[PDB]
């Protein structure tokens, strides 16, 4: 079969997210509160894109040929991305709610430094459950077949409990806040004529709220089939599983491309950095 597409997506997300991540640092023009969140989310997208050789290696051999220390690291990196990504999309969508629905209070509540603090708070929660995956995760041999397994390890119920706990707090609640945030923003984007008193603020608030909306919308479509799959399998096909993992790795690499088409300022630095 043809397998270069897997390597293709590996380099787009590894180079894109690190470009997205560099442009916000070097160029002071685009250190916005929204871009502090995008930085944080590309950082996640980069770190989880360095596990693609691991996933492919397990795909061919059907076993874990790395050690336990590399089984705990990638288990860690896996959760840190799982939580950081969705908690950053939830805080962008709240940031956006504040930006377009509360303009008077956004003068003092939308400073890029404040974004940093909230993104520092996001990694504190996420690595906390990423430190647990180090504790819980580990290597072990399947009972019958002679194949090493890298998973989380005392009761089969607590496995279904934590998976249910993750579905509620890592997907369902955060999507409910976005669903709510954008319901109230679309009303005010339709009702209000000039959003912030400047015909250029209004253009920017509208233009960037659409960016986050697509970035979030793409994200649920990629992560819905994998989240309902780990929950259905807990109630007890394999070709479906990898098509649920391919979706999630594709999302990690799409986000840089999405910033390019949805943000004229990202579109502009990808030019002067790539084609001076």
């Amino acid at each position: 079969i043809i397998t270069a597409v897997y390597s293709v997506v590996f380099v787009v997300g590894l180079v894109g997210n690190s470009l997205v991540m560099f442009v916000i640092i070097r160029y002071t023009k685009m250190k916005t509160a929204t871009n502090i969140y995008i930085f944080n989310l590309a950082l996640a997208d980069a770190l989880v894109t360095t596990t693609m050789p691991f996933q492919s290696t397990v795909y061919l051999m059907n076993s874990w040929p790395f050690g336990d220390v590399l089984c705990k690291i990638v288990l860690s990196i896996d959760y840190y991305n799982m939580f950081t990504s969705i908690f950053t999309l939830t805080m962008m969508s709240v940031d956006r709610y504040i930006a377009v629905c509360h303009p008077v209070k956004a003068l003092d509540f939308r400073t890029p430094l404040k974004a940093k603090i909230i993104n520092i708070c996001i990694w504190l929660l996420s690595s906390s459950v990423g430190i647990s995956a180090i504790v819980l995760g580990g290597t072990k041999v399947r009972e019958d077949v002679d194949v090493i397994e890298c998973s989380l390890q005392d009761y089969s119920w607590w496995d279904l409990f934590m998976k249910i706990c993750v579905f509620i707090f890592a997907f369902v609640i955060p999507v409910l806040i976005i669903i709510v945030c954008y319901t109230l923003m679309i009303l005010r984007l339709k009702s209000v004529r000039l959003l912030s008193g400047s015909r250029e603020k209004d253009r920017n608030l509208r233009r960037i709220t659409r960016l986050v909306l697509v970035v979030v919308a793409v994200f649920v479509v990629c992560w819905t089939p994998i989240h309902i799959f780990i929950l259905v399998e807990a109630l007890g096909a394999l070709s479906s599983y990898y098509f649920c993992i391919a979706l999630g790795y594709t999302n990690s690499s799409l986000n840089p491309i999405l910033y390019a088409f949805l943000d004229e300022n990202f579109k502009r630095c990808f030019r002067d950095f790539c084609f001076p």
Partner: nanobody
Amino acid sequence: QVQLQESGGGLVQAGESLRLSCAASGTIFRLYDMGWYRGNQRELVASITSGGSTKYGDSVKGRFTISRDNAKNTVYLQMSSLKPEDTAVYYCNAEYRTGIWEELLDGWGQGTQVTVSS
């Protein structure tokens, strides 16, 4: 795109009446304020909101009458008891928005010529 269609001007003898329309054709997601603006030309003569709040120039109140058909995106200006002082070019103006996510825009029209005989 959007195009402003104007009609109703011309040469006319004093004390006569005219009627000016300005339809906003094209992809309109929401129209905001339409109006007529006659040294520097741009000077307000009549503007009406999508609600119905009007505002006439200092010289044009009492003789002109502005009116808006939100169903047809057209605005009408009924000019009565024209004087030769009223001779100028009358430019139409519309604040619209092409879409939810798009910016606010200010569209002018070509301009309608009015020349009142003495």
